[PDB]
Design a protein around this ligand. Structure first.
Ligand code: HEM
Ligand code: A1BY9
Length: 435
């Protein structure tokens, strides 16, 4: 009853229902997400007010689904799901060190090596006939990159290793959205497995440090540092799992969506191929300076995130009753922000369903609080530049070497768990560039 005065209803996903309702009912709409009543706020004024202030914190009730699943601790109080400001701020500032300019520049070798491995595997299949799941291949690449970059481990998913691990991730993500008997069993065991991987890799790191082996400072270094005097390792494992999942899942989804969309954009692909040819030539390795020169690719990736944001948005807690765009919203209410919804509204983007990289051209007016694929403010993505770099490296190497055609019958639709991803496996046939 407390929300009844708020406007609202009396490969298609929940975000699409939200889009319809925002269009029908306006900038402040009452909805149902993760069992609770929330209010979807879609004016840029609101985006600015709530996301760009340390006064507004994440809503713990909406993050409970990440913290624990079916009685199994998952992301716990890790960096994504911690909703206490002071607790978040402590760990954020420590982990920030792993995402310094110099830290990320040093990762270029890892990005290049995994991208090169992917391309060599695809080249051998490029007979214009063999169907290849680009969703799968890009997920394996993203995982291999993350495991090495963040934790100094070799998952070798591109070599067909760690199949149970990939199964565990899938079942766990299904688990988040779920919240019969067999599904519960599978989800719980998957979560415990991932945390055990954490214990294993943490023990390996500690052993290396004791034996005085060389350990390059990485994300794991800072995750350990953040827990320097904790009672137990549960906080450490929270962050292990957080970074293990967040560090590859969205990157993989972003790559897959981009490949999927580009399969129906031959002119844009031709332009991208030309840009890569001109900037890097036949070089096997992209330098950091090369990344900045791939300006058209940067625009295409931005436009991909407008239409296909893997991370659709965020929640903040409204503590006190507040007027939001002429609507009285009661205190203690989750506000839902969605870059997916706003990206597809004609009031914010002309011809919203058209894929046009020119929206992000140098001279074009920049979206003002209508586009936030990495979120905004203090709780924005710590991994934003990491992700931007790795995806540019992967995409550039694909464009350098291969032509992709989507297998007829493959859909452009979405599926939604916690994050958005292609409904279909992005099955493509491949040919080497140059006939
Ligand atoms: C293209 C890929 C990516 C996208 C679109 C993306 C998007 C986002 C979004 C929307 C948030 C806000 C989440 C929320 O409010 O619940 C976020 C936060 C976060 N992301 Fe990412 N992300 C990406 C890649 C990465 C990578 C590569 C890492 C780690 C290596 C990462 C780690 C995180 C973490 C730890 C947070 C929580 C930050 C904080 O609250 O202090 N993400 N990301
Ligand atoms: O679910 C939410 N955030 C969320 C969830 C996930 C998950 F579950 F797929 F692991 C991953 C990321 C992420 C952020 N950066 C990279 O991955 N974010 C909030 C409540 C809406």
């Amino acid at each position: 009853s407390r929300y009844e005065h708020i406007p609202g209803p009396p490969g298609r996903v929940l975000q699409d229902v939200f889009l319809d309702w925002a269009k029908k009912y306006g900038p402040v709409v009452r909805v149902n997400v993760f069992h609770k009543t929330s209010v979807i706020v879609t004016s840029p004024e609101s985006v600015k007010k709530f996301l760009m202030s340390t006064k507004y914190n994440k809503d713990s009730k909406m993050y409970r689904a990440l913290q624990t699943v079916f009685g199994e601790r998952l992301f716990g109080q890790g960096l994504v799901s911690e909703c206490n400001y002071e607790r978040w701020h402590k760990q954020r500032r420590v982990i920030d060190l792993a995402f310094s300019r110099s830290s990320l520049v040093s990762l270029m070798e890892t990005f290049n090596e995994k991208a090169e491995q992917l391309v060599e595997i695809l080249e051998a299949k490029a007979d214009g006939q063999t169907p290849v799941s680009m969703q799968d291949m890009l997920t394996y690449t993203a995982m291999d990159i993350l495991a090495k970059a963040a934790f100094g481990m070799e998952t070798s998913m591109l070599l067909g290793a760690q199949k149970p691990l990939s199964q565990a991730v899938k079942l766990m993500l299904e688990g988040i959205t779920a919240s019969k008997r067999k599904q519960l069993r599978e989800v719980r065991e998957s979560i415990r497995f991932l945390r055990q991987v954490g214990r294993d890799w943490v023990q390996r790191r500690r052993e290396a440090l004791k034996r005085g082996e060389e350990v390059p400072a990485d994300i794991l270094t800072q995750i350990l540092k953040a827990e320097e005097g904790a009672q137990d390792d549960e906080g450490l494992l929270d962050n292990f799992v957080t970074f293990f999942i967040a560090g590859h899942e969205t990157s993989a989804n972003h790559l897959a969506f981009t490949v999927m969309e580009l399969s129906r954009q031959p002119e844009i692909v031709a332009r991208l191929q030309a840009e890569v040819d001109e900037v890097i030539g036949s070089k096997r390795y992209l330098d950091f300076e090369d990344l900045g020169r791939l300006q058209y690719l940067s625009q295409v990736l931005k436009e991909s995130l407008r239409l296909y944001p893997p991370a659709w948005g965020t929640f903040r807690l409204l503590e006190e009753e507040t007027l939001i765009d002429g609507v009285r919203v009661p205190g203690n209410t989750p506000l839902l922000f969605s870059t997916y919804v706003m990206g597809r509204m004609d009031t914010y983007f002309e011809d919203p369903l058209t894929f046009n990289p020119d929206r992000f051209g140098p001279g074009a007016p920049k979206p003002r609080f209508t586009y936030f694929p990495f979120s905004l403010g203090h709780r924005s993505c710590i991994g934003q530049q990491f992700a931007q770099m790795e995806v540019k490296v992967v995409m550039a190497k694909l464009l350098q070497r291969l032509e992709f055609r989507l297998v007829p019958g493959q859909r452009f639709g979405l599926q939604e768990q916690a994050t958005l991803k292609p409904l279909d496996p992005v099955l493509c046939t491949l040919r080497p560039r140059g006939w």
